[PDB]
Write a protein that binds this ligand. Structure first.
Ligand SMILES: Nc1ncnc2c1ncn2[C@@H]1O[C@H](COP(=O)(O)OP(=O)(O)NP(=O)(O)O)[C@@H](O)[C@H]1O
Ligand SMILES: Nc1ncnc2c1ncn2[C@@H]1O[C@H](COP(=O)(O)OP(=O)(O)NP(=O)(O)O)[C@@H](O)[C@H]1O
Ligand SMILES: Nc1ncnc2c1ncn2[C@@H]1O[C@H](COP(=O)(O)OP(=O)(O)NP(=O)(O)O)[C@@H](O)[C@H]1O
Ligand SMILES: Nc1ncnc2c1ncn2[C@@H]1O[C@H](COP(=O)(O)OP(=O)(O)O)[C@@H](O)[C@H]1O
Ligand SMILES: [Mg+2]
Ligand SMILES: [Mg+2]
Ligand SMILES: [Mg+2]
Ligand SMILES: [Zn+2]
Ligand SMILES: [Zn+2]
Ligand SMILES: [Zn+2]
Lengths: 11, 491, 491, 245, 487, 8, 9, 11
């Protein structure tokens, strides 16, 4: 794995 | 002794679930078909040097069709298929476990191109700890046997090891490495285009009217079901038939699906109302406070059915249509707080007497004022700091910051709710006639349609979207495209 | 080897419980009569394409008719019925949890249209946690084996899997999903229309008086037993026959019922445990404070009987009729606190000395003051914030808020009770002579009914509702309609 | 394996404890003789249409004679009497608690008209909560097996589930509901009318002085022993038998 | 039972020493183990006791099993293998009896390699109960016959596990498992040699050379093990024949890297035209902030196509290093805060997005204040900070310290916040350019950033040939010593 | 609350 | 939350 | 924490 830096969901 | 058997059945029954039955997870079923596409047509891949991928993990929330997606592979791939559960390995001895995984794959080598499916792999996939509790050692021996047999010496080819779990985070990183499980497929709960195709699978064995085409109804039914999953759609199709046949009807109307939604979201609608006319009047003015505040606030959810007939553990309900969003802003979260507080405000304006019936309204306003400040970073004074909240099932064991910070947090929840409270009080005190109109009609009809709100209050003055075609305006495709790539056109 | 069989019982005794023996909850019966109506009339349900539901969970407080409603299901259904408990699965070894769930579904699916019942599923359906102690290891292997058997590859049709529980919130969301437990049924405590039909079930074997009629008496006993559960009505009907048989009576009088409602609520009634003449003078002034303050307050409960004879853990005893109402206001909770504090107030006006006898009167006032401030939103300084207040059997780990909030709460409880204290001191000094009238008869006649307190104090100056037909007449039905739908007309 | 059985001894021998030997509990002996009056004369109760209560609970301070009042309930009806403690269920392994509740009630039905006494039930009858502590979830398994075997399927008749305790406040509401424990009976400490009668039960085997009357002496020793439990009075009549010996 | 379940394998395995390629200083020490069997002379010339074997240790996916496969093929001696878990059986007395039959099998094929994969199934901390006394007598049976090789002249026993800490220290005495060959994750020199093994069976594009690409793929994949490298070379072939492509090109490898660490590139997700505009303005704020800070990691790929648990992502090139200064940790906080800042400048509204951004800002600043000495006011102290997910028991410091800590973390985050607000307001038009290009293309590469923003103003390091100039060898070397003249 | 008393 | 409510006593 | 024994059977 490595750096992903996502924008997660909030539902 | 003869406890060395794998208790895994080589599945000989023709499962009648094709890939056309598995909808919604479109990009997830493509990476399962390539296991079938390789074993059926190896020439497309072996001409590019592509080896067979070793396995896959099917993760996601429960009820999403990660077992159904394994059921589609058994009924479509012409290879032998065996099934086993992840908690079948351990029994009451020491050798059993590791001596049962060894005969899971020795069976899976007699069937040479086979595919095996391990369901609930988190029973023997738990991460190995240090020198610890004595029952933990037998799980680690069964895992270490599973790790050698998937990648090591005497590891044959042409064995695709499908696996499914819903807690992948507790799994050992020795299982999560490639060479054991080359792909980790996350089957999440589908969107509205995914639910509309899950209705098309399950509206198919029903019996609708002379009207109600099964295609246009699936678009309507995915609109009325935000946030559901692959199996919540399966009850709404099923339990609308059990309501249609309880009243002994010939074909399932549209009014029978909506009674199947509200049963699952709400609960048992009680026939005998028991409330006195001085405490049905209080519930009526309370539910009108949820109705009118949700009707006059932007970013509040659309309204479907205000009803003072008791249902579930409540004395009334509101039946909102939650906007299926992924990013809540700060003002959208305020207008849920200014709506959830709206019932107690309408009691306080009309009666002057706060009641204990707004207990579940206040717990929601509490938890959506702590998650904004602690969990999110919506507060300027606490800062841009995020933590982890203990859940309701989780037990508060120690707070992970100072009591001078928790003094700062609780002083800011109390400002946040009172800012949400004063907005609602200054909303339902000039709309006092409109709350009066709604709840008096609640005292005869005892439910309200959305059309009843239109006949009473008028059109909702905000950019409201309700149907399927106005939820799926942005993508411009109007349907879940089940288009296949050029190497996958054998289906 | 030896350990591992399911120890289930395919019950062969014809259970004499029908659906007519379950009353109070038709909305819970009707969704379980749909399982038996499927197994008797499959053609009605399969002309609309309805599959059988794969099971149901029965949630609720203790004593509401959840095991009884599973006994009635084994009554009418013409299919075999298999019964296990939740705690039967784990025994002393590893793996014998999941190895015993598989043998449960071996015996289950061997019978083709069977119905299976797992009583008290909280022992196995406990939510799967993260990395913790090894007692949670072999529990989650038993839960994951269950979830494979409920919905997996080895899942056949027409096997109904019922289960009942008291604690729904600790259960696993993978277990409460559609496909595992399709119906989620909450059986609450019965209402007054619900309770009068539970009396009609249990007044049926009794030999009553020739004057009393079982329809009018069932309405009267439901008005005199407020807030009771379904298994309380079975106890009032039982012990009124046992009271009638101590006195060698030929038929059960209504007076024999009123001694059974008092015995269940109050406890054992010690007539021989005598007190000193300076102790009875104190207990009579204490109980007259509960009588007179409960008499002159508006929203206090209507009183039945005040005694000074030792009953259970107590020197006196008061008998109230709690108002069945679901929405307590802020004034209706103060008048319940001003009634409970009236016992210390009366023995402080008359004596000056205060005793330790008002300990249990102060534990109710304390718990009803945290509940207004912490748990409800009845306070301005704390705000409209709700917290999960810990119960008596809940060893609290740490508060869900700061310390300066807990300082803010315990200040407001002191302001609350000392405003309830001063409101009662201002009550029993204006009515000081009436307290002395009541307690001087209590020293002469050790009990006082409601009638001889009308003889002292006149009629109570508030409208009080006392009969069934007065508790019900606002609704407009007067009975509990057991009107089955059109497609259920086999019962 | 030897871990797993209920280890509850059956006193199927005729117990020599009667209601003649229990004093100070005159208002509480009446609630428990109804269990015996049912088993002797069922026709008296079944004409009105009565049933036996399934079991009673005995709350109060220790030493007030709960086991003595339970052995009197068996010695009248000539029924077998099965003793078990509430701390004998919590074995250190997992699921042995529910494995011994199922063996207790299997023994309570092989001897069918018996009267079962579970001593100190507040060790396995504590109120069920959330994830408190490691090892607390084994008590909740043992409690839920006790709930099923009393009021559920596989429920027999003609068993009297007696249970003594000291702290009824910590008990689960699912045990205290009617159907499991139909009668809640509080046995307090005896007063001086109470324990003067308790001396007369224990002064009658002793040989006293020629000047001391048992009607007079039991009134005086009840004045010289304030606040004793019932078991303490039984030692006062036994310690002085040793001192004279 | 007593059956040893071992397989005397002499099969022509296609694993050679040319297939390991990057664990080179760990490679020679097993070439020394083959030298012990073939030459018992030059290690007894100096009176040295020839060791019995080593334990191959390291992270999972590294090579501690493949390097035992390559010993079976390269060395002409016979090979026998088990796993550690194959010894414990139901009956008491089989576990300490199979280890006889394994070590008696090694005598009938006397010069032999003998590999026990996952040895932590046997080697554990001793203890008690009869289930724990079984692996105590099994491990004692291993130690007795390990020392009992004085009669034989040549039996070597390898071992491989990924957990050396749980092993019993009785195994590690002289005359026993002496050496511990730590097979660890490679640097970029050794990693490009791993790609050369797995670019070999592929039918690549004709305009790609299998050595200029293996250096390019090692540049784009930092921190990977020897298993993640073999997966990218396999996934990009499966991506290739998905579209019935003629040959694998460079775009297929850039997706197989993007597949493993990203998730599932799914197009069927519905997003409103306002909720894509929020995500595009969000992750341009991560892209411009990492573009303009000196110690931030270089940008690799930014996309807004959803990947499982994320609406978008920004793949970075993490600078694989061992030490972090105070301002190398500041520029990561100023970049991680950058997406939330860009949502505030362009909109004025604050979303529940950048929740996982604000976690990293917290768990860095807590570790920076508490368990390093990065704050002057708190001091030069270090505390065992409990990790997230595990229960927090009781703090090892006072409440007045925790008031001092939590007031300085709030200063540290606002100093990281005001620096980013000052960064992305002066550079406001450059965040507008990066985001609208994501609003129509939905994937940006570093080449799309250079064409849009110009070159990065800092002496960055992205090419493989500038990653390698720190030593001066310019290529990874595979050479033999003078005492290893048979391999 | 259906019962009030004076405890011991 | 799909539906708000008015809880019991 | 309660124990769950893994019984190694004898001869
Ligand atoms: N995408 C889907 N399309 C159609 N039906 C679906 C879908 N997903 C789930 N279902 C239905 O849900 C049931 C199976 O759900 P499934 O996806 O197998 O959940 P699951 O997560 O694998 N079970 P579990 O592992 O216990 O959580 C069947 O009744 C299917 O018809
Ligand atoms: N609705 C009802 N109608 C008639 N009798 C009832 C009703 N509800 C409860 N009862 C009586 O209560 C007894 C106990 O019911 P039961 O269902 O066994 O307890 P429960 O409600 O299931 N709570 P529990 O089983 O302890 O979780 C039954 O045997 C009936 O005598
Ligand atoms: N140095 C390497 N060069 C090339 N391929 C490698 C290398 N190391 C590992 N691999 C690949 O990884 C596969 C198995 O590696 P392996 O040695 O089993 O990893 P591991 O370190 O043993 N993980 P574990 O199974 O927990 O011991 C091989 O078949 C190769 O495809
Ligand atoms: N009311 C009583 N009358 C006579 N003896 C009593 C009385 N109460 C207690 N005892 C004596 O005390 C013992 C009763 O056991 P006890 O300690 O009360 O059991 P538990 O601790 O379960 O309440 C008996 O030996 C009996 O002789
Ligand atoms: Mg599943
Ligand atoms: Mg029950
Ligand atoms: Mg390995
Ligand atoms: Zn972000
Ligand atoms: Zn009182
Ligand atoms: Zn509400």
């Amino acid at each position: 794995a490595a750096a992903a830096a996502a924008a997660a969901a909030a539902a | 002794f003869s406890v060395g058997e794998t208790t895994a059945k080589v599945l000989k029954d023709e499962i009648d679930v094709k890939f056309k039955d598995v909808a919604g997870c479109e990009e997830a079923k493509l990476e399962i078909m390539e296991f079938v596409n390789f074993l059926k047509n190896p020439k497309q891949y072996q001409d590019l040097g592509a080896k067979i991928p070793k396995g896959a993990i099917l993760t996601g929330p429960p009820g999403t069709g990660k077992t159904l997606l394994a059921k589609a592979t058994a009924g479509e791939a012409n290879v032998p298929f065996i099934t086993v559960s992840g908690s079948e390995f351990l029994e009451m001895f020491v050798g059993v476990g590791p001596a049962r995984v060894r005969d899971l794959f020795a069976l899976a080598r007699k069937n040479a191109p086979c595919i095996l499916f391990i369901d609930q792999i988190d029973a023997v996939g738990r991460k190995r700890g240090r020198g610890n509790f004595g029952g933990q050692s037998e799980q680690e021996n069964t895992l270490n046997q599973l790790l050698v047999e998937m990648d090591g010496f005497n590891t044959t080819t042409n064995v695709v090891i499908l696996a499914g779990t819903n807690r992948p985070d507790i799994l050992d990183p020795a299982l999560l490495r490639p060479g054991r499980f080359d792909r980790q497929i996350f089957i999440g709960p589908p969107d509205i285009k995914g639910r509309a195709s899950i209705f098309k699978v399950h509206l198919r064995p029903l019996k609708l009217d002379s009207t109600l085409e099964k295609d246009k109804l699936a678009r309507k039914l995915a609109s009325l079901t935000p946030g559901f999953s692959g199996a919540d759609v399966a009850n709404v199709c099923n339990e609308a038939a059990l309501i249609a046949a309880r009243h002994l009807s010939d074909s399932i109307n549209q009014k029978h699906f909506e009674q199947a939604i509200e049963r699952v979201i709400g609960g048992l609608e009680k026939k005998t109302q028991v409330l006195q006319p001085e405490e049905k009047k209080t519930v009526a003015y309370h539910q009108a406070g949820h109705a009118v505040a949700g009707w006059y606030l932007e970013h509040a959810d659309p309204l479907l059915k205000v009803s003072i007939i008791p249902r579930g553990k409540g004395l009334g309900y509101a039946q909102y249509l939650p906007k299926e969003q992924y990013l809540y802003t700060k003002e959208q979260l305020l207008d849920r707080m200014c709506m959830t507080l709206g019932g107690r405000v309408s009691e306080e304006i009309f009666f002057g007497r706060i009641t204990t019936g707004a207990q579940d309204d206040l717990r929601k306003v509490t938890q959506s004022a702590y998650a904004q400040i602690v969990q999110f970073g919506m507060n300027e004074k606490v800062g841009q700091i995020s933590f982890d909240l203990p859940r309701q099932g989780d037990m508060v064991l120690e707070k992970p910051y100072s009591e001078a910070t928790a003094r700062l947090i609780d002083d800011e929840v109390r400002i946040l709710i009172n800012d949400a409270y004063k907005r609602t009080v200054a909303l339902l005190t000039e709309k006092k006639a409109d709350v009066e109109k709604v709840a008096l009609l609640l005292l005869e009809k005892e439910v309200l349609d959305k059309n009843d709100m239109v006949e009473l209050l008028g059109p909702r003055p905000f950019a409201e979207k309700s149907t399927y075609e106005e939820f799926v305006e942005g993508t411009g495709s109007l349907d879940e495209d089940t288009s296949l790539p050029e190497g996958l056109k054998d289906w």
